[PDB]
Every structure is written in C-alpha cells, then in structure tokens.
C-alpha cells in the first residue's frame, strides 16, 4: 500500500447510464418510490463522471404542496449534463420521502444522497473509493 497523503483518496461517482442501463424517463421512474419512516442520508464525494441524461423533477399533492424535501444549502445542481429532462407531476396516494429501489444514489454537486430534493438536477449513480498518487494521476487523466 502506497498512501502518503490523506488527499490521495478519491471518491468517484459513476452514473448508471455508463453501465448500459436504460435511462429514458419512461423506464427510469420505476426504480423510484415513496416510503415513510426512513431518515435521509448524504455522503460527500470528490469527482464524478460526465452524465448523459439528467432529471429535474418536482411532484406535488392535489392540495398544492410538494412531496419532495426542501434542499439544504449544501445541495447544488449536477455539474455536467448533456440532456436534462424537465418533469412536472402530481401523485395523490403517496406519503413519505422518495427512495431508490436498486440501492443506487442520487448524485448532485459532490453530494450523493438517498433521497431526491426539490428543484435540483441530479443523476443516478454509485461512488467508489480508490488511492491515486500524483505521478499515476498525471499518467491516466489527459
């Protein structure tokens, strides 16, 4: 093991679209659901893959309030998206928070979350940790 500085540990976010997973909003909405009784969690990562399709989603009840959470000041838009799908919806019979059925994470600007927020552009992805020093980093990055 060659680990000399703490900032040699990278946390990369790879999207599901690079895993040949169908990413149209038609068949990407069946990996998502509502559930009560689970707290949301966030985890910091460092860098990530440039995304192919991203999503911007706000859903509401028939009384007029959003079913997703209010985003904190930490949450920002995803940096690079080739295509952003704007979906406005309404879901009567559904209480709780939004969760992912595959166990994947909703990627934002250096924050991976288990829930979806309001008015923020995310993607679907998973993170991985590795140890890279500078001499090997300059060899692969280009």
């Amino acid at each position, epitope marked *: 093991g060659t680990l000399q500085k703490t900032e040699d540990v990278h946390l990369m976010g790879f999207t599901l679209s690079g895993q040949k997973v169908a990413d149209s*909003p038609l068949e990407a909405s*069946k990996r998502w659901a509502f559930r009560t009784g689970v707290p949301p969690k966030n985890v910091e990562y460092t860098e990530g893959e440039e995304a192919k399709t991203c999503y911007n989603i706000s859903v509401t009840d*028939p009384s007029g309030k959003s079913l997703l959470l209010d985003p904190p000041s930490n949450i920002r838009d995803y940096p690079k998206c080739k295509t952003v*799908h704007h979906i406005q919806g309404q*879901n009567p019979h559904a209480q709780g928070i939004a969760l992912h059925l595959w166990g994947a994470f909703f990627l934002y600007d250096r924050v991976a979350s288990t829930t979806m927020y309001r008015g923020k552009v995310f993607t679907e992805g998973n993170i991985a940790a590795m140890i890279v020093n500078k001499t090997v980093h300059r060899m692969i990055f280009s």
Partner: nanobody
Amino acid sequence: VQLQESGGGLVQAGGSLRLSCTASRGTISLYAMAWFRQAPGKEREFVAAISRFYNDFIGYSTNYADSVRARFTISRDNAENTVYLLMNNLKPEDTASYYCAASTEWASESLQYGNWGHESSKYANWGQGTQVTVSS
C-alpha cells in the same frame, strides 16, 4: 363530452378560490384535461393541464403557465369524474373568464415531460366558463 364549470366569483387580492369541472355524459378517464382563461380584449391563454395515465411514481403529469406557477394547482378525481383547480394568492391581473377543456389527441404513450398541451387547436368540448374577478 359535455362539461360544466363551477366555483368562480369575486374575491379580494391575495384570496383563494377552488373551481370544479364536471362531465355529465362523458367519462373523463379517457381525456387529458386543461384549464384556460380569457380577459376582455385579450386572447384565450393557457393556465394548467393534467394527463391521463398513472405512473406510480410521478402519478399524473401536469403543466402550468409561467404566470401561475407556485400559486395555482390542478387536480383530478376519477371516481367522482371531476377536475379541480385550487388558486391561491390572487392578483388583479388574474381577473378572467375561466374555461375547461379536454383532448384525446394527446394522452397516449405515457409521461409527458416539458411544455405539453400548451396549444388550443386540439382542445375541444369547451364549457360555458365561470367568471373569476380579483379586485379591491
């Protein structure tokens, strides 16, 4: 097919109303339905629209005009065969005659992302409308 509107009236600025749209001889579970408004001396403009499939997640896909976002909400109840619009925080620029409409041209396939149903040449079966007046 035959639609009617109800629930309009005169309110002050910042008030709220709820309009109902019912069908007598038509089951609304085959149509995508929308609310419009028209001012005297102005053209008939889009307000809101709601789709026809359910999708479990993102249940009914809706769309709103930019002047009425975060204030108006549209909804439907299939068993009661009714489409509601709840309007909150009214301005005197919202004073108009409101109309209910349906289409069968769209509402196929599934989830309609982005500005959809914003036109008026495909909507038919307009009701007589109701007058919403916001003034001090």
